[PDB]
Every structure is written in C-alpha cells, then in structure tokens.
Amino acid sequence: GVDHFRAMIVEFMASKKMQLEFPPSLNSHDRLRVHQIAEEHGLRHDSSGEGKRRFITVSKRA
C-alpha cells in the first residue's frame, strides 16, 4: 500500500484523539488502505463531506 498512511493512523491510534479526516485525493488503493488499517484496528472508517469537498474519515473507538 503506502506506509505513510499507516504511520499517520499509528500516531492517531497511539494519540486516540477522536477522528482523523484523510483527503479525497486517495485514488483507490490509498482509500482502501485507510479503510483496511481502520478495520484491522478499532476505527469506524467512512466517507464524509457535502459537495465536491468529499473526504475519508476514520473515528477512534477509544
């Protein structure tokens, strides 16, 4: 995949903030990766945004 995302999600996991909004710019494989890391962990991965400013959100189940 792209390990850059994993390291971001790992910070977010260790930090256990609340949610993290990743950009729409994830082509396919990158979005699928954010989903997969989230699914492997305890994160609710979903898409968010109203108009052409869509994004990917992952939420930390504390």
Q: How many residues does the chain have?
A: 62
Query: Could you write out the DSSP letters of every residue in 16-29?
Result: T-SEEEE-TT--SH
Nearest C-alpha neighbor of 55 from the set 36, 41, 34, 37: 34
Domain CATH code at residue 18: 3.30.1370.50
Domain hosting 36: range is 1-62
- DSSP single-letter state for residue 45: E
Count: domains in the chain: 1
15-19 long-range Cβ contacts below 8 angstroms, 24+ apart: 16/60, 16/62, 17/60, 18/59, 18/60, 19/57, 19/58, 19/59, 19/60
Structure solved using which method?
A: NMR
- DSSP single-letter state for residue 35: H
Residue 12 in tokens: 């977010």
- Phi-psi label, residue 49: left if phi above 0, alpha if psi -120 to 50, beta otherwise: left
